[PDB]
Amino acid sequence: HMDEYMENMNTDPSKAATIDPNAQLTTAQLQTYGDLSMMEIYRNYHYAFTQQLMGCWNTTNYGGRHTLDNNEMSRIWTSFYTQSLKNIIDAQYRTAEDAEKVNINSVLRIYRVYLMSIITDTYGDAPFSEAGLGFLEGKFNPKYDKQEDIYNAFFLELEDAVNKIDPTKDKVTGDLIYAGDVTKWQQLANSLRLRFAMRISSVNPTKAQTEFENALAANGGVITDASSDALIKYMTIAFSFGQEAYSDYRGNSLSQLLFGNDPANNPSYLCSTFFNQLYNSGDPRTFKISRCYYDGLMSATSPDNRVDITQEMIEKGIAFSPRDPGAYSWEPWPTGYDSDICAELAVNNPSVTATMAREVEPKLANNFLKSDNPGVVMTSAEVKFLMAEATVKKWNVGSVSAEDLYKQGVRAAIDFLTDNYGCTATTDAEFDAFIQDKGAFGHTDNQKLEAINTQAWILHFTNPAECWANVRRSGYPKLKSPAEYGFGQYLTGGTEIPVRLCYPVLESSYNKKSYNEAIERMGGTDNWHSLLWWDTEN
Ligand SMILES: [Mg+2]
Ligand SMILES: [Mg+2]
């Protein structure tokens, strides 16, 4: 089926919805979190590997118990190379060096870098420079570019893009991140430069510092307040898991999937690592991100009519039972209680029970289960954390103290929930009480890097690609294998939490030489325990 492979991996004008560059951008943006098939990878792997969710069958089975599954691992590769990245490549190619299309071209180059970053931060070496060119240039069988070289190209592409943007030129018309404000595109591009500079800070400290400092000084500057956060706009659409929903990117499919195809039996239960970080630190977001719900009246298609038992649990002294890494909602079975709230519901309703069991395991709050939840690309809060870490590393990034940058990042991360998810606001007094106690910055460099990156991990909950990248890069939080929680007997894929995903096996058939050459650079095996180039330690 080389024919289908070739058709699917290159933009075919005769079959493609459109080759208009502005339209290509719109559809690529929506795909990022709108592709319901692709989002399975995050529920299956990332959210377990970062120990944020655990207990849903899918999360625990795949990532929580290290089940290697080449088809499940393939989703980012397939989805991006056969749709958004290929289409962005086609659009970029057609607008390159056209003086009348410098803004759309520059924006395409920025978003091309962003999508490619997700691919390389998942798999390592991957097609980039030669990708998507079969119909444009007759160039098939693209080489897998080395990750080091991909990162070099990120910095160069982003720099050139910010230098070519000119608000006097072409209008960017279907842009669901910034409604064509190309100044905000410059801010995003320079912020991505910060992200990628910090990413390479362990493997190449000299280059990291230089790129970080270059980005701060670059045309348009960086994202310095939340109004320039890069968030893809999604519409409210009913959640459907019928066959036609898999081609509908209008709604946030990550939110759909975290609600679930089986929402009553397999909701998004929180992992103990994350719930306990929040709860034990008195984090104001504990019960903004999570609640305990009884779902006996909840429909199969939306998180309406759930019964919030969180406050009753607290009043009655019932312990929350978040899921350790490796645990299912049913294993170990939690200690429950008889609910007064649910007993009232049970009056003259045989559907309902008053006896809570798995309802004592914290669940993702309804605010994060909406079709119109944003698609998070990058935030001002993250920029603050990157600046804080650069400052601890003694880079030359301005006059603000590392501690103040850190505190600004935490405040922004908390406010992000208020502004974008309808969560209850956090007051100055609440913020100060937290930052003065368990949210404090710390005294030693290691304490400070731990605080920064732990706070980043919480911020990246809604951005699982970046969450997993930053956990691997920074080493924080320090996570233990499911083996350390009692689940070692089940870890078929090996004891250690995976640090990358393997290449799709069909690459062996359809791009064999390139595939074999990439695998040879890792020593000749394709192993999800192999560290990526930027990832210097497990
Ligand atoms: Mg690492
Ligand atoms: Mg070998």
How far is ligand 2, taken at its centre, from the CA of residue 520, in Å?
6
What is the rounded distance in angstroms from the CA atom of residue 130 to the CA atom of residue 496? 34
How far is ligand 1, taken at its centre, from the CA of residue 90, in Å?
34
Closest CA to 353 of 332, 330, 337: 337
Residue 221's Cβ-count burial label (10 Å; 0-12, 13-18, 19+) is middle
Centroid of chain to Cα 190: 19
In angstroms, the Cα distances linking 510 to 1, 4, 397 are 9, 10, 46
What are the tokens at 87? 């289409």
How far is ligand 1, taken at its centre, from the CA of residue 453, in Å?
12
How far is ligand 1, taken at its centre, from the CA of residue 533, in Å?
10
Q: What is the 3-state secondary structure (H, E, C) of 220-261?
A: CCCCCCHHHCEEECCCCCCCCCCHHHHHCCCCCHHHHHHHCC
How far is ligand 1, taken at its centre, from the CA of residue 457, in Å?
14
In angstroms, the Cα distances linking 374 to 25, 38, 170 are 17, 17, 27
Ligand nearest to the CA of 475: 1
* Domain edges within the chain: 20-538
441: CB partners within 8 A, 6+ apart:
402, 403, 406, 407, 447, 448, 451
What is the rounded distance in angstroms from the CA atom of residue 447 to the CA atom of residue 389? 11
How far is ligand 1, taken at its centre, from the CA of residue 470, in Å?
8
Ligand nearest to the CA of 526: 2
What is the rounded distance in angstroms from the CA atom of residue 371 to the CA atom of residue 323? 26
**Looking at 423-501, which runs of residues are DSSP E strands?**
none
Ligand nearest to the CA of 523: 2
Angle, CA of 212, 214 and 215, to the nearest 5°: 65
What is the rounded distance in angstroms from the CA atom of residue 449 to the CA atom of residue 451? 6
What is the 3-state composition of the chain as percent helix, strand, coil, each rounded to the nearest 5? 55, 5, 40
How far is ligand 2, taken at its centre, from the CA of residue 522, in Å?
8
Q: What are phi and psi of 109, to 5 degrees?
A: -70, -40
How far is ligand 1, taken at its centre, from the CA of residue 168, in Å?
44
How far is ligand 2, taken at its centre, from the CA of residue 240, in Å?
46
How far is ligand 1, taken at its centre, from the CA of residue 125, in Å?
17
Closest CA to 307 of 354, 350, 274, 271: 354
How far is ligand 2, taken at its centre, from the CA of residue 517, in Å?
10
The resolution of the experimental structure, rounded to one decimal in Å, is: 1.5
Q: What are phi and psi of 177, to 5 degrees?
A: -100, -50
What is the widest separation between alpha-carbon atoms in the chain? 72
Ligand nearest to the CA of 522: 2
How far is ligand 1, taken at its centre, from the CA of residue 36, in Å?
29
In eight-state DSSP terms, residue 269 is B
Ligand nearest to the CA of 537: 1
**Tell me, what amino acid is at 319?**
A
In angstroms, the Cα distances linking 496 to 49, 228, 253 are 10, 38, 30
How far is ligand 1, taken at its centre, from the CA of residue 538, in Å?
4
How far is ligand 2, taken at its centre, from the CA of residue 194, in Å?
35
**Tell me, what amino acid is at 381?**
A
Q: Judge contact between 26 and 40, C-beta under 8 A.
A: no
How far is ligand 2, taken at its centre, from the CA of residue 525, in Å?
7
Cα distance from N-terminal residue to C-terminal residue, the chain: 39
SS3 category, 61:
helix
Any idea which residue has 């954390």 for tokens? Answer: 385
Closest CA to 469 of 447, 501, 496, 438: 501
For ion ligand 2, residues whose CB falls within 5 Å: 523-524
What is the rounded distance in angstroms from the CA atom of residue 417 to the CA atom of residue 288? 8
Ligand nearest to the CA of 521: 2
DSSP secondary structure of 374-409: -EEEE-HHHHHHHHHHHHHTT----SS-HHHHHHHH
How far is ligand 1, taken at its centre, from the CA of residue 528, in Å?
13
Way the structure was solved: X-ray
Q: What are phi and psi of 88, to 5 degrees?
A: -60, -45
The H-or-E segment that residue 291 falls in is: strand 290-291
What is the rounded distance in angstroms from the CA atom of residue 427 to the CA atom of residue 425? 6
Any idea which residue has 């079969």 for tokens? Answer: 134
How far is ligand 1, taken at its centre, from the CA of residue 315, in Å?
41
SS3 category, 294:
strand
Taking residue 261's Cβ as centre, other Cβ atoms within 10 Å add up to 14
How far is ligand 1, taken at its centre, from the CA of residue 474, in Å?
6
Ligand nearest to the CA of 519: 2
What are the tokens at 376? 């998070």
How far is ligand 2, taken at its centre, from the CA of residue 140, in Å?
26
498: CB partners within 8 A, 6+ apart:
45, 49, 63, 66, 528, 529
How far is ligand 1, taken at its centre, from the CA of residue 255, in Å?
28
Ligand nearest to the CA of 533: 1
What are the tokens at 419? 């502004």
What is the rounded distance in angstroms from the CA atom of residue 46 to the CA atom of residue 38? 12
